C-alpha cells in the first residue's frame with residue numbers, strides 16, 4: 092500500500108516480531124498494530 | 127505518504143473505510159502477510175514513539191471493481207485500518223477488546239496444518255462481535271516445493287480447509303447477518319505464499335479469461351471453481367467429471383488456474399531455458415533488465431510477483447467484501463449499548479451519527495515512551511471527539527444515577543494511532559478508530575466516554591481466561607518493596623488477564639491465565655514494571671485449627687503467680703453454625719437475646735449457653751466462641767476482659783502450628799482467683815486463659831468448585847485427573863458443551879491446569895474459586911499422616927521445633 096500512498100509507514104518482518112522474547116522463540120508472542 | 131489533510135479527507139468518506147485485523151494461529155504467517163500489506167499499501171506521514179497498535183493502508187480500485195462492491199461507496203479510494211490483536215488466545219478479554227473496534231477479519235489458515243484450535247478460538251470470538259471473515263490459505267509454496275503434492279490433492283486440501291472454516295462460521299455467526307460463510311467462487315478466499323509475494327482470487331482470473339472465452343466474468347468465476355469442467359473435445363462446459371465415454375475430466379480450476387502456475391514452477395525450477403520464454407510470453411509476463419538473467423527461485427519469485435502481485439489479492443477481498451462502520455453499527459448498536467434500544471445514544475450508534483452526543487468506547491490503554499504515560503485507544507461510535515473537549519469518563523462500574531467511576535475532564539489531545547507513532551489531530555467523527563491522550567489516571571483498561579448526562583455505558587468468544595496459575599512475589603532486597611508494589615500496579619493496568627492481590631499470609635500474589643502467561647508477566651514485572659530482583663515461590667496454603675470432639679477431660683492451667691486457675695473444656699462448633707457466623711446470620715454485635723433465641727431455636731443450642739457467649743474470635747468476629755458456664759466466681763466480671771483478650775490471642779494462633787482456629791467452642795467450667803486484684807491482673811490471667819485454651823484444644827482430638835467446560839468425549843479425562851487428586855465430582859450439566867463441577871483440594875491444584883489439558887487433549891477449560899474448609903481426618907501430631915506432613919513442613923519452614931507440644935505441656939496438675 093505504501094507504493095500507492097506515501098502516508099503509510101512500511102514495517103518489515105523484523106519490525107513486527109521485534110521483542111527480545113519473540114526473537115528468542117522465533118514466533119510472535121505480542122499483538123502488533125500496524126497502519 | 128499522505129499529509130494530515132489528505133488523511134483527514136480520507137477519514138470523511140467512512141463508506142470507504144475498512145476497520146479490520148488479521149486472525150492467525152502462531153507461525154501461520156500473520157506477520158509476513160502484514161509486512162506484505164504494509165510494503166504494498168502502507169501509509170506514512172508526508173520524537174514520541176508508541177507501541178505499534180494499528181497501521182493504515184491505502185487502496186484504489188478500478189471503476190468496474192467499485193461497481194461490484196455490494197455496499198455504499200464514494201469514489202475509488204479506500205482507507206484500511208489494520209488493527210493489531212494480542213497473541214494470547216485463551217478467549218481472553220484483551221482479544222475481545224481489540225476485535226470490538228474492527229468490523230471485518232482476514233483469517234489466515236495454513237495449507238498443511240489447516241484450521242487449528244487457536245484459529246478457531248479467535249474466529250469464534252470474532253464472530254461473537256459480529257465480525258465478517260475472509261480467508262487466506264497461506265504457505266501454499268510448502269505443498270509445491272516440499273510435499274510435491276498433486277493438483278487434485280492440493281484442491282481437496284483447500285476444499286477441506288474451507289469446509290472446516292464454514293463449520294465454525296455456521297455454528298457461531300448470528301443468523302440475523304445471513305450467510306457469513308466463505309466461498310472461493312465468490313472471491314472471499316485467497317490462496318498463496320506470504321513469504322514468497324503472490325496471491326490471487328478466482329475473480330482476477332475470471333477477469334483475465336472472460337474477454338478471452340467470450341463470456342462475462344460473472345459466468346467465468348462460477349466456472350473457475352468447484353465442479354465445472356471444460357471438455358476440450360466438445361468445447362463445452364459441464365458439471366460432470368467424466369465425458370459420454372466415461373473418461374475423466376479435469377476440473378476447470380485445475381486446468382485454467384493451477385496448471386499455468388504449475389507449469390511456471392516446473393519450467394523455472396528445472397531450468398528449462400527454452401520453455402520459459404514461451405510460457406512467459408503466453409502469460410504476457412515481461413522481464414526487464416537484470417531480470418532477464420535470473421534463474422531458479424530468484425527468477426520464480428520475480429515472475430510470480432509480476433504475474434499475480436500477494437497484497438493485491440488480500441486488498442481485493444478487504445475492499446470488496448469486508449464491511450465499512452455505517453453498515454455494521456446498524457445491527458451492532460444494541461449489543462454494544464447497555465442502555466435503552468430506543469435511547470437517543472443507541473440511535474446515534476445505529477446511525478453512526480457524528481453530530482450526536484459522544485459515544486466513544488475505550489478498547490485499552492497503550493504503553494507510550496512518554497515517561498509512564500498510557501494513551502487510550504478506542505473507537506468513536508457516535509458524535510465526534512475534539513482536542514480540549516469536555517467529556518464524561520465512565521469506568522466499568524458507572525451508572526447514570528450514581529457518581530461512581532464518573533470523571534469529567536477535558537481531553538488533552540486527539541491522536542491518530544499509526545503503528546508506533548501518533549499524529550495530533552483536532553477532531554475525529556463517528557466510525558473511526560482513534561487515540562486519546564490525558565485519560566491515563568481516570569481509566570485503566572476498558573471504559574466509555576460520553577458528552578451526554580443520560581449516556582449509558584458500552585460490552586465480549588471455544589485458551590484459558592481464568593487466573594488459575596499463581597505465585598508469591600517478593601523483593602530480594604527489603605528496601606525495594608516500594609518499586610514492587612508500584613510495579614504490580616503498572617503490570618495490572620497493562621494486562622487485563624493478570625491478577626495481583628495480598629494473601630491471607632501477607633504475600634503479594636501474581637496470578638496468570640496459564641503457566642506461560644504468568645511467566646511473561648513475572649519477567650515483565652521484574653525487568654520493567656518493577657525493575658528489581660524478585661523472588662518467586664509457591665503459594666503457601668493457609669489452614670485452620672479445630673477440634674473433632676469435646677475435651678477428653680477438664681483442662682486445668684494456672685497463672686504465672688500460681689494463684690489463679692482456669693478450668694475449661696473445648697468442643698466442636700457445628701459447620702452450619704460456623705458458616706452462619708462467617709456469613710452474617712449469627713453476629714458478634716447482635717443483641718445477645720435475639721441471637722441466643724436463634725442459636726437455641728434454630729441451631730439446637732441451649733439458650734443459656736448462647737445468652738452467655740463472652741466473645742467470638744479471632745478479631746472479635748471469628749467462628750470460635752467462649753461461653754461462660756461458671757456458677758459462683760466472685761470476681762468474674764473483673765477478669766472478663768483478660769479472658770476475652772486471651773481468646774483473641776488463642777484463636778488467632780492455634781497450638782498445632784500457629785494457624786487460626788475455626789469451629790472451636792470453649793466452655794469455662796470454673797475459675798479460682800486470688801482475693802486481691804493485684805495478682806489477678808491481665809498479666810496473670812491472659813496467659814492462664816491462653817494456656818488453658820490450648821490445653822482444652824489439644825485434649826479435644828485436634829485436627830486441621832472447580833467448574834470445567836468441555837466436549838462430551840473429553841469429559842472422561844476430567845474424572846481421570848480428579849481421581850488422581852483427591853477430587854470429587856459435584857455436577858454434570860449441559861446444545862453447547864458440558865460443564866463438570868467438582869471439589870478440588872487447593873494443595874492438589876498446582877499444575878492441575880496442565881494435567882487437565884493433557885488428559886482432555888487440550889479441550890477442557892478450568893475455573894476455580896475457594897469454596898469451603900474441609901477437616902482432614904488424620905492426626906496433625908503424627909509427622910507421617912497426611913495432616914501431620916503438612917504440619918511438619920510448616921513448622922520446619924517457620925523454624926519451630928518439629929515435635930508439636932502435647933496437651934500435657936499446657937496442663938497444670940492440681
Ligand SMILES: Nc1nc2c(ncn2[C@@H]2O[C@H](COP(=O)(O)OP(=O)(O)NP(=O)(O)O)[C@@H](O)[C@H]2O)c(=O)[nH]1
Pocket residue numbers: 117118119150151152153154155156157158159265266267268318319320321322323
Ligand atoms: N514458502 C513460503 N514461506 C512463507 C511464505 N509466507 C511466509 N513464509 C515463511 O514461513 C515462516 C513463517 O512466517 P511467519 O510470518 O513468521 O508466520 P506466523 O504465522 O506469522 N507466525 P506465528 O504463528 O508464530 O505468528 C517464515 O519462515 C516465512 O518466511 C510464503 O508465501 N511462502
